[PDB]
Every structure is written in structure tokens, then in C-alpha cells.
Amino acid sequence: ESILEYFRPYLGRIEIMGASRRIERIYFEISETNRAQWEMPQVKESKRQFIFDVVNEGGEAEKMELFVSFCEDTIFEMQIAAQISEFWGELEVQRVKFLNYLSRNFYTLRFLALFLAFAINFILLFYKVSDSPPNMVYYFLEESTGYMEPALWCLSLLHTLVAFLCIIGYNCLKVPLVIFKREKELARKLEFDGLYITEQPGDDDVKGQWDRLVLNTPSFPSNYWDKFVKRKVLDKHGDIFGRERIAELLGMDLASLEITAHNERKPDPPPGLLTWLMSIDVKYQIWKFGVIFTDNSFLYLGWYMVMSLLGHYNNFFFAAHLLDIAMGVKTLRTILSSVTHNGKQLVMTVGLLAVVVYLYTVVAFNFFRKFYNKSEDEDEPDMKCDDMMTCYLFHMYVGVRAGGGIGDEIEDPAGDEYELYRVVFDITFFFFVIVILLAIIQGLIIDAFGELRDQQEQVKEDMETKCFICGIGSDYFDTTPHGFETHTLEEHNLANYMFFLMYLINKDETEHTGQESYVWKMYQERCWDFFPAGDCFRKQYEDQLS
Amino acid sequence: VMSLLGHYNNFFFAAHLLDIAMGVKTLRTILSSVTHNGKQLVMTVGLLAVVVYLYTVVAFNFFRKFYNKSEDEDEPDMKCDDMMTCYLFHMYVGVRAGGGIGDEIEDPAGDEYELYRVVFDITFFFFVIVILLAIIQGLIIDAFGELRDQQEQVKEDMETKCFICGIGSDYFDTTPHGFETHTLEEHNLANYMFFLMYLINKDETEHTGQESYVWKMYQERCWDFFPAGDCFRKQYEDQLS
Ligand SMILES: Nc1ncnc2c1ncn2[C@@H]1O[C@H](COP(=O)(O)OP(=O)(O)OP(=O)(O)O)[C@@H](O)[C@H]1O
Ligand SMILES: Nc1ncnc2c1ncn2[C@@H]1O[C@H](COP(=O)(O)OP(=O)(O)OP(=O)(O)O)[C@@H](O)[C@H]1O
Ligand SMILES: Cn1c(=O)c2c(ncn2C)n(C)c1=O
Ligand SMILES: [Ca+2]
Numbered sequence: 001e002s003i004l005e006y007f008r009p010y011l012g013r014i015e016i017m018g019a020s021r022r023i024e025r026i027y028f029e030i031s032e033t034n035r036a037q038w039e040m041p042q043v044k045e046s047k048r049q050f051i052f053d054v055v056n057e058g059g060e061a062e063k064m065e066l067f068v069s070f071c072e073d074t075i076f077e078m079q080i081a082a083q084i085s086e087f088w089g090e091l092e093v094q095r096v097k098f099l100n101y102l103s104r105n106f107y108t109l110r111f112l113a114l115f116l117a118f119a120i121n122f123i124l125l126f127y128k129v130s131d132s133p134p135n136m137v138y139y140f141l142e143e144s145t146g147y148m149e150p151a152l153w154c155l156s157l158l159h160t161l162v163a164f165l166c167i168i169g170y171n172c173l174k175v176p177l178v179i180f181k182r183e184k185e186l187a188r189k190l191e192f193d194g195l196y197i198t199e200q201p202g203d204d205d206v207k208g209q210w211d212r213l214v215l216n217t218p219s220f221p222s223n224y225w226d227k228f229v230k231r232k233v234l235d236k237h238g239d240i241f242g243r244e245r246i247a248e249l250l251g252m253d254l255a256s257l258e259i260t261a262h263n264e265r266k267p268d269p270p271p272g273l274l275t276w277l278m279s280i281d282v283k284y285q286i287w288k289f290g291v292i293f294t295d296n297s298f299l300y301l302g303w304y305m306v307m308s309l310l311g312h313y314n315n316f317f318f319a320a321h322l323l324d325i326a327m328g329v330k331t332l333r334t335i336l337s338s339v340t341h342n343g344k345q346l347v348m349t350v351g352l353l354a355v356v357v358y359l360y361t362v363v364a365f366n367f368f369r370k371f372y373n374k375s376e377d378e379d380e381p382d383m384k385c386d387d388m389m390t391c392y393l394f395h396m397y398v399g400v401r402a403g404g405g406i407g408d409e410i411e412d413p414a415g416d417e418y419e420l421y422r423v424v425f426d427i428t429f430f431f432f433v434i435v436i437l438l439a440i441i442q443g444l445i446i447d448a449f450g451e452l453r454d455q456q457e458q459v460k461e462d463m464e465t466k467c468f469i470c471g472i473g474s475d476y477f478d479t480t481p482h483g484f485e486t487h488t489l490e491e492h493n494l495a496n497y498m499f500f501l502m503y504l505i506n507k508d509e510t511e512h513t514g515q516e517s518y519v520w521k522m523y524q525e526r527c528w529d530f531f532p533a534g535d536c537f538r539k540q541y542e543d544q545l546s
Numbered sequence: 547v548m549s550l551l552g553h554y555n556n557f558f559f560a561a562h563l564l565d566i567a568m569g570v571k572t573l574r575t576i577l578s579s580v581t582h583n584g585k586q587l588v589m590t591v592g593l594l595a596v597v598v599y600l601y602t603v604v605a606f607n608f609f610r611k612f613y614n615k616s617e618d619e620d621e622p623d624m625k626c627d628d629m630m631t632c633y634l635f636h637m638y639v640g641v642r643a644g645g646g647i648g649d650e651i652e653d654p655a656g657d658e659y660e661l662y663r664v665v666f667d668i669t670f671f672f673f674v675i676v677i678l679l680a681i682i683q684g685l686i687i688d689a690f691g692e693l694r695d696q697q698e699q700v701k702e703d704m705e706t707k708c709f710i711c712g713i714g715s716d717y718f719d720t721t722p723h724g725f726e727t728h729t730l731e732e733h734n735l736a737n738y739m740f741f742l743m744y745l746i747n748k749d750e751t752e753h754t755g756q757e758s759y760v761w762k763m764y765q766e767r768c769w770d771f772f773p774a775g776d777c778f779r780k781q782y783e784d785q786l787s
């Protein structure tokens with residue numbers, strides 16, 4: 001028992017459907033380093049988000065495919081974390097160390113930038129403008145504490161510095177993940193779907209048309225595992241679409257590849273910086289800039305940098321930075337998501353408000369028009385409804401903001417034949433405008449909040465109901481004490497599947513046994529049969545008493 | 547302490563009144579519904595303060611002329627000469643006044659900034675008066691509905707699939723009053739408690755084999771004895787119990 005306890009964290013077990021119809025268990029060794037790195041908190045948050053979106057979108061048909069894709073992305077993040085782990089050559093090594101430090105401390109730089117923005121606005125809270133020179137009004141700092149203006153200038157410069165550092169840090173740690181995901185998706189598309197071979201991508205696919213640049217570039221397999229996807233595509237579609245066409249489209253040289261398959265050479269690379277800058281792929285960098293400019297967070301950070309420079313120019317611009325708390329705090333982000341869940345509804349509701357206000361102005365510009373004077377003095381009357389642009393402006397500026405409608409502003413119609421007419425007009429206006437539309441505005445937000453709360457509740461219950469791999473009622477396992485728990489914890493653990501895949505990739509091909517060889521190649525074929533859907537050893541050997 | 551403070555100054559006694567929130571139960575439940583989202587409310591009013599500060603920032607440089615509140619022409623009263631006083635005026639008047647701050651701010655007609663200030667007032671009223679109070683309303687309504695749903699699920703759980711076994715009522719229902727009898731006698735929680743008390747009460751030398759087993763195994767903090775998802779009906783269904 002002792003050695004079993006000692007090796008308990010390192011002993012991994014998985015279950016496969018098998019070549020026959022009997023479920024078979026495979027035992028392997030789990031890397032402790034990989035386990036700890038999987039138990040690092042960023043991966044934990046990433047997998048919480050992954051399972052949240054999988055439960056929210058259902059994805060029952062391709063759930064296993066989603067898990068496999070997540071595992072591949074997580075392995076790429078594993079490689080990233082391994083790279084980030086702790087004259088010309090000196091500056092290059094200092095540059096890479098600085099980039100690694102910014103990648104490690106990207107979040108701290110964001111929090112420091114927020115703190116300095118708050119400090120700058122607190123310094124700006126003391127500014128007084130005096131008409132007299134401290135003849136036009138002169139903004140200045142009215143305070144008794146010395147060197148507050150130099151302190152504000154130093155904080156401005158430091159904040160801009162921090163913003164720059166944040167830009168570089170984000171460019172360091174976030175871009176390679178999106179580039180890897182795009183390259184993997186494009187490789188799958190052009191290998192199995194063939195969106196460029198015997199087919200053309202959709203015009204509405206902006207990224208589909210943007211990815212046509214790196215079709216012939218030699219840097220297409222960069223930042224991605226498979227460096228021969230184009231090779232497989234040629235070996236799969238050359239006899240149909242035309243080998244010359246495939247060759248020109250996907251940029252491989254038959255002579256070069258064949259001579260390297262016979263015997264390749266090892267030429268010396270010139271270490272010149274000029275020839276390195278000439279060997280930098282221009283088209284691949286253009287495509288990378290095109291894909292990175294479509295990202296939301298990169299544009300947000302670039303806007304933050306631009307606003308920092310604007311603040312340095314005019315101090316008042318710094319105020320805008322305050323809005324960064326909506327993304328720095330989480331509850332503010334959730335509430336703003338609840339608000340923007342029904343953004344389409346709100347804009348068309350206020351459009352209906354504008355339409356009905358225009359209809360009221362139309363039906364008021366011909367009748368009750370006399371009751372549109374707002375000048376107390378009798379010598380200079382002030383008609384506010386002589387024409388409809390001014391009458392509509394008056395109505396939408398005053399009647400909406402004023403509680404009770406526009407009747408209060410409009411002249412009392414008593415002693416006049418139009419008394420009842422205008423009374424009804426005001427009643428209808430108040431009831432239809434002030435009440436109903438604001439009721440819709442209230443209900444949309446309340447319904448969005450309730451909708452997201454219900455989404456969280458169903459995500460919780462789904463995450464805790466009928467296992468994951470099998471999707472079978474807990475009751476059966478519950479018959480045995482801690483049955484469902486044990487089933488999900490050991491038999492079909494998602495971390496166990498991930499560890500088994502990682503082990504297969506890590507170990508050599510010559511050391512694989514028959515079952516793991518089968519699983520490895522069959523996985524390479526993108527088929528997911530191995531997953532034992534709705535089956536376990538308890539069911540398989542219930543007669544055998546397992 | 548408040549009683550002693552009341553003895554000192556009679557006015558302190560007023561504070562004691564608040565004891566009805568804990569003495570009455572419905573007041574405690576409503577105050578729990580209010581405080582269920584206490585974190586949400588304070589950060590919502592913080593967002594209100596932030597957006598009010600942004601409006602004061604964008605008003606201290608433009609529309610500043612329209613900040614006089616003195617009817618008499620001899621002594622003008624600028625309320626937005628600096629931003630601390632201008633922010634204080636905005637957060638004291640525009641929030642409390644229905645319709646925003648545009649009413650307090652001077653009419654911009656006949657001026658180039660007419661449309662500018664009109665848009666400012668519109669945006670202020672819509673973003674401040676409506677949305678944030680809508681969030682305040684929705685948080686309380688959602689907390690009330692949440693606690694009501696919690697009570698409803700507690701009721702149904704307390705009356706569903708027994709307690710000890712956690713097995714569907716239907717099986718027992720097959721026999722009339724089956725589930726009822728099952729929960730009432732077979733696995734009564736009071737019966738478990740009474741059995742434990744009896745084991746503790748009786749001497750160690752008078753214990754039989756089964757109760758000795760249960761007693762010592764209980765001392766070991768293991769809870770196996772609990773018949774999870776099993777009863778004599780299931781065990782002796784062939785034997786017809
Ligand atoms: N086959 C399965 N393998 C693993 N977990 C499963 C499976 N089927 C369902 N689950 C559910 O997934 C849950 C994952 O564990 P849980 O969310 O409680 O961990 P955690 O402490 O939040 O993890 P972490 O700190 O890594 O984020 C299990 O508690 C279980 O309810
Ligand atoms: N194994 C179980 N033993 C006892 N009650 C169970 C069991 N499983 C479920 N229950 C539920 O617990 C309930 C407890 O009884 P109930 O709540 O109706 O009593 P009560 O009149 O409110 O009690 P009291 O006056 O002691 O508070 C049962 O009516 C039943 O629905
Ligand atoms: C090493 N390696 C693989 O072997 C692999 C993979 N994706 C699929 N496979 C097979 N990735 C991303 C990877 O890094
Ligand atoms: Ca071999």
C-alpha cells in the first residue's frame with residue numbers, strides 16, 4: 001500500500017471504448033510538472049470560462065471536439081508558460097528579458113496605470129479658473145502645497161510610460177495565442193474543408209478573405225504545430241485540382257522538397273541585421289497586423305495609450321481613463337453586460353419614442369398651435385411652434401424631461417373650445433410617452449438580469465448533473481455510495497483525458513503499446529470514438545461484479 | 547450603551563426603536579432581501595458618482611457660463627467657477643431634481659451652444675435618472691425573487707425522494723402510503739437520534755453485538771450504518787418482507 005500512496009498523484013487511469021465492444025482501462029504516468037502547471041490559476045480560470053461557454057452553448061454534438069480543441073490550446077499555453085518561465089547580443093538579451101518581465105507583470109502594470117489615473121484625477125480636482133491673471137479666464141492650480149504642478153507633470157509622464165509598457169506586455173503575451181488559434185483553424189479548414197481548393201471562401205468572411213495572404217507565404221506554418229499541413233493538402237488534392245495549381249497556391253517547391261527528402265543540406269545563416277530585416281516576411285507581418293487590429297482588447301489598449309497622450313497634451317483628457325474601472329472590476333463588467341444584453345431593443349425603443357414624439361408634434365402643429373407662447377412679457381411674444389423643426393425640438397427637449405408630459409408647458413386651454421381637445425392631447429401624451437416607454441426600458445434591463453441569472457443557474461446544474469463524458473443519470477451510480485462522485489472524479493476525469501493525450505504526445509512512437517498506439521493514431525485522424533459515451537466498467541462488468 | 551446614552555440625553559432613546567427590525571420577523575426577512583445585494587448597491591452608487599463626476603468635468607469647460615442662480619443682477623452667483631463646488635452643486639441638485647440638471651442650468655436658446663446643452667441635458671437625464679435607478683429597482687426585485695425561489699426549492703427538496711435514501715418516491719408510492727411510511731418509520735431522523743442517545747445512555751456491558759458495532763463504528767466517525775438508498779422492502783422484495 002505504501003508505494004501506491006507515494007505514487008498516487010503520478011498514477012493516471014483512462015478508459016477507452018476499444019477495438020472490440022468492451023471498455024478497456026489504460027494506466028499511465030502523469031507528469032507532476034504538467035499537473036502543477038495545470039493547477040496554476042490562470043489555466044483554472046481559462047477552463048472555468050471554457051466549461052461555462054460550452055454549457056451555455058450546449059455543443060452536445062461536438063462537445064468532445066471542443067474539449068480536444070481546448071486541450072490543444074492549453075498545451076500551446078503550456079509551451080508559452082515554459083517560454084515565460086524564469087553589443088547586439090547584449091541588447092537582444094536585455095530586450096527579451098524585458099519582454100519576459102512585461103509578460104509576467106502585465107496585470108500589475110494595468111493596475112498601476114489605473115492607480116496613477118486616479119492619482120492624476122485627484123490632482124486635477126484642485127484646479128481653479130480665474131478671469132484675472134493669477135484678461136480671458138486662466139485655468140491654474142489653486143493650492144498651498146508646493147511643486148504640485150511638477151508632480152502632476154511627472155505623474156503624467158509616468159502614466160504614459162506605464163501605458164506603453166502595457167502595450168508591449170499585451171503584444172507579448174496575448175498575440176501568439178490568437179495567432180496559433182487562427183493558424184490551427186485555417187489549417188483544419190484548408191485540409192478537410194478545402195476552402196481554397198476546388199472552393200472559394202465567402203465574401204462576408206472578412207477573416208476568410210484576409211487569410212488568403214498567408215496561403216503562399218513560407219511563414220504560414222510558423223507558431224503552429226503542423227509544419228506540413230500544406231504537404232498533406234497537396235498529397236490529398238493534387239490529382240484532382242491540379243498539382244501545379246496546388247503548388248503555386250500553397251507555395252511549396254517540388255524540387256526542393258524532394259531533394260530534401262533524399263538528403264538535405266545545412267547552410268550557414270548570415271547573422272547580419274540588414275539581411276535579417278530583409279529576411280523578415282513582410283506579407284506575414286501584414287497579415288498579423290491585420291488580424292491583431294481586429295481584436296477588441298488590443299484596440300482598447302491602443303485607445304488607452306492615445307488617451308494618455310491626449311491627457312499629456314490637455315490635462316482634462318485624463319478624466320476619460322477613469323472608465324477603465326468598468327473592465328478592471330468584474331461586477332461592473334457583469335452589470336454592463338446585463339445592460340448591453342438588450343442593446344438592440346433600447347435603440348429601437350428610443351426610436352419609437354422619437355417617432356411618437358414626431359407624431360404628437362405633427363398633430364400639434366396644426367391644432368393647439370396658438371397655445372405655444374412662453375414669453376411672460378406681452379411686448380415681445382415668443383411662439384415656440386411657428387414651424388415643425390423648432391416645435392419638435394421644443395417638445396423633445398421639454399416634454400420628455402418634464403414630469404407629467406408637455407401639457408404643463410402648453411398654455412391652459414380653459415375658456416376655449418379646444419379645452420377638451422388639448423386636455424385629451426395632454427392625457428394621451430403623458431400616458432403613451434412618459435409611462436409605457438420607460439416601462440419597456442425598465443423591463444428590458446430587469447429581464448436581461450434575470451436571463452443572465454438563470455443562465456448561471458442552469459450552467460451550475462448542468463455542470464453538476466449526469467456526469468460529463470457519459471451524460472447518464474446520477475441515480476445509477478448513486479446506488480453505490482459516492483458512486484456518481486467517484487465516476488466523475490476517476491473513471492472519466494477530464495484532466496485524466498488531457499494527461500493521457502499529453503503522455504501519448506510526449507512518449508516516443510517505438511515505446512507505444514497496441515492500445516495507446518491505436519488511441520494515438522485514431523486521435524490523429526480527428527475521430528473521437530475512444531470517448532466511452534454512456535458506458536463504464538460498472539455497466540460493462542456488472543455481471544462480473546467489476 | 548445606547549440605553550446609557552439615552553439616560554444621559556433623552557434624545558438618544560429614539561435609536562432603540564430600530565430594535566423592531568430584529569424583534570419582528572417580516573422586517574428581518576425584508577432587510578435580508580435588501581442586504582442580499584449590498585455589494586451591488588454600493589458599487590452602483592459608485593458608478594453614479596463616477597458618471598456625475600464625468601458630467602461635471604465635461605460641463606466645467608463648456609456651458610460654464612450657464613451657471614448663475616442669482617435673480618438679482620447686482621450680485622451674480624457663479625455655481626461652476628471651480629469643479630469641487632460645481633460637482634457639489636450637480637450631485638446635490640441634479641440627482642434630487644426630477645428631470646436632471648437641465649432645468650437648473652440656464653436655457654441655452656439664442657446661443658450657439660443651444661443644441662450642445664440640449665444634448666447634454668438629454669444624455670444626463672437618460673443615463674443618470676433612469677438607468678441607475680432601474681438597476682436599483684431590479685436588484686431588490688431579483689433578491690426578493692431569489693429568496694422566494696430558495697424557499698420553494700427548500701420545500702420541494704424537503705418533500706422529495708426521502709432523506710436517508712434519496713430514492714424516488716414512486717417506488718414506495720406503488721404501495722399505498724408507501725413513501726410516507728418509509729420516511730416516517732423506516733428512516734426517521736428522530737429515530738436515528740433516539741437510537742444514538744440510547745447507545746450513549748446504556749452501559750457498555752449491556753450492548754449486544756449489533757449495537758456495540760454501531761456504537762464503536764460511530765465513535766470512529768464513520769457513517770456507513772446509514773442505509774443509503776436501501777430499505778427492507780428492496781432487500782426482501784422477493785421475500786415479500
Ligand atoms: N467526467 C467528469 N470529470 C470531471 N468532473 C466532472 C465530470 N462530470 C462532471 N464533472 C463535474 O465537474 C466538476 C469539476 O470540479 P470542481 O468544479 O468542483 O472543481 P474546482 O475546485 O472548481 O476546480 P479548479 O480549482 O481547478 O477550478 C466536478 O465537481 C463535477 O461536478
Ligand atoms: N427519512 C425521513 N425521516 C423523516 N422525515 C423525512 C424523511 N425524509 C423526508 N422527510 C420529510 O421530513 C418531514 C418532517 O415532518 P414535518 O416537517 O411535516 O413535521 P412538522 O410538523 O413540521 O414538525 P415539528 O413540529 O417538529 O417542526 C416529513 O413530513 C417528510 O416530508
Ligand atoms: C506536439 N503537438 C502535437 O503532437 C500535436 C498538437 N496538436 C495535435 N498534435 C498531435 N500540438 C498542438 C502539439 O504541440
Ligand atoms: Ca514497439
Ligand SMILES: [Ca+2]
Pocket residue numbers: 751752753
Ligand atoms: Ca455483554
Ligand SMILES: [Zn+2]
Pocket residue numbers: 467468469470471487488491492
Ligand atoms: Zn463519466
Ligand SMILES: [Zn+2]
Pocket residue numbers: 708709710711712728729732733
Ligand atoms: Zn428513507
